[model samples]
Target: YLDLFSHKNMKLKERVLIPVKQYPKFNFVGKILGPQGNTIKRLQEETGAKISVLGKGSMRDKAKEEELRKGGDPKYAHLNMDLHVFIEVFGPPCEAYALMAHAMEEVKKFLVPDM
Candidate 1:
């Protein structure tokens, strides 16, 4: 009985998705990703949440992305890039919730601009 309750998190991993990009994008992805993706990698490890980036629109889109690195331009359009997080725990739901909440906040913190 207790085992059943305790183990559900293993089966029911919590999932969360965050979308960022509405203006043909900026350095938002690379910013949150950090140099070599070290930023988000560390965040995921610290937060106990598995985080993944979504909607890159593939490698060819890198052309569009690189061109905008100097400053975002309006030419590139349509790729709706976003984020994903999966929280699972052998610990309590609070542990899962806390990880999820904190992870989201940390992501946005990185996701923010220099301004």
Candidate 2:
């Protein structure tokens, strides 16, 4: 029971889904991903967060995504073409928050200036 109270024995995992395209149709994934995945690697180091990119929609979903991108249905107009990137920050609660904050800042910087 005492071990449960120790930080070393505790388990913490927190995740956030960040949209790859902050804009309606513009994708910033390539920018964040960088050449040969270096940018994402840097992000992981800086934030201490495990980052994984969600695949571009599957074959079945791809067609629907294309339609949506082409202004398909009015109701589905909100859909965007970019996949969502998932981030998993592990540590104590406050540490996880710090990691998430750093990751967000890095992502924001990437989205700015060029886009």
Candidate 3:
């Protein structure tokens, strides 16, 4: 049972976690995952890496419609900040690192333009 990153075998391979931040209206998880999960799938197969995504939303409550007047609440805790960008490459040490970098770059394409 290859239970994601928890597998004992997975621990033996080179792994990397690429954390990303999501802002209001800038949620990029869809871009990374792509339509029908094709983007990440291609990245995994081409790079020969195992990958998974976690965290869409926590169980935290949000303000009701009446409270969502769009006023800035700087202190308000953000959503999707905890989502993970995970990657694991298994192969020769050097090649593993290489694939990791490539996969990272490809995923990062979805993580820009803070405007």
Candidate 4:
């Protein structure tokens, strides 16, 4: 879930359609280095979410990639071109939508006994 706009992120009172934890957490996932390198690209198209690929040429790339594949961590991965998908929305500054990160625990509790 993410915010469309927020009071802090905007000057006016915008009618923001905020997503609660009840709303499915929209994620765009893919393998940037797997299967011809198009999986990440396709996920972007499907979800229409913003994306970022980190560690283009860092020595940490190998370790990050290995960890991601092994599922030791969340989706954090290293790529010659790393794969990423950011939850996407429009109409306000990105800071508004980014507020969702702050509400992870609360949002879950607001809807579920355990998340």
Candidate 5:
């Protein structure tokens, strides 16, 4: 039987949660995740870190949408739609830091092509 409290089954590694607000647009978010999530896969393989980028709609904006609905305003409805970006990395402490650096560098490529 597998023991739930066994040390061998436990992971003592570090986990880092980095939220990136650079790309609020869907197009740019796609650039970060790349085609079919291959970019994130490559980053994880090369850095020895598990990495994931999540694109979620803002819940705060949903509240705003409810307020706007009460007022019957169609013009501001588009403002309620926004994408939030989150990056979660897991590994050794040093490797997790390195992954964060590389992840930022990768995103910077699109933000600052002149750099």
Candidate 6:
């Protein structure tokens, strides 16, 4: 079960809720991956979505992957990885398919559970 986070200083249990804004439609750039990325792109385009593929050694890669400094906290580790990009879409979930011309199954991938 999930508890509400609206209560002020409600003594957070073992878990905490972080709030984020939602948009009607959003195109979150995932990352600047290495070579052989055309396959991922083909996969995304095949699904009829606007997925972007940024190449390495690009400005976006540097900004997204730059690690932030920590304040000497023993309980936590330093941020050493690039920022992971995510795609957030609003409205009804799209049942999009890729490569309609070809005989293949298409599925929508998301980070959260499906309703």
TM-scores for every candidate against the unseen true structure: 0.54, 0.54, 0.54, 0.27, 0.39, 0.24
Which pairs of residues have clashing backbones in candidate 3?
none
Tell me the lDDT of model 6 at 55.
23
lDDT string, candidate 5, 6-106, tens digits: 44422223322223444333354455457777876776676554544432332234575567656857754444443433345645455556776675556
Task: Report how far residue 101 has shifted in candidate 4, in Å.
Answer: 11
lDDT-best of 1 and 2 = 2
lDDT of 6 by residue, 1-115 (tens): 3233323222111111111123213332332222456644665555443333222222234554343123434322223322222222222222222222121222223212131
Candidate 1 regions exceeding 4 Å error are 1-5, 10-25, 57-91
lDDT of 1 by residue, 9-106 (tens): 53225444433444346555566566888977887788877765544432236676555543554443323343433344344665666776777677
Please list all clashing residue pairs in model 4, or write none if there are none: none
Candidate 3 to native Cα RMSD, angstroms: 10.0
Candidate 6 wrong stretches, greater than 4 Å: 1-36, 53-82, 88-115
- Model 1, residue 25: distance off in Å is 4.5
Arrange candidates, best lDDT first. 2, 1, 3, 5, 4, 6
lDDT for each candidate structure: 0.54, 0.59, 0.54, 0.37, 0.49, 0.29
Please write out the lDDT profile of model 3 over residues 29-98, one tens digit for every residue.
5666678889879878876777665433322224542143245464322333355566667654456567
Tell me the spans in candidate 2 whose CA falls farther than 4 Å from its real position: 1-5, 8-27, 57-82, 111-115
What clash count goes with each model? 0, 0, 0, 0, 0, 4
Candidate 1 versus the native: TM-score?
0.54
The per-prediction CA RMSD against the true structure, in angstroms, equals 8.6, 7.8, 10.0, 12.7, 9.8, 15.3
In terms of lDDT, the best-performing candidate is 2
Window of ten residues with lowest summed lDDT in model 3: 57-66
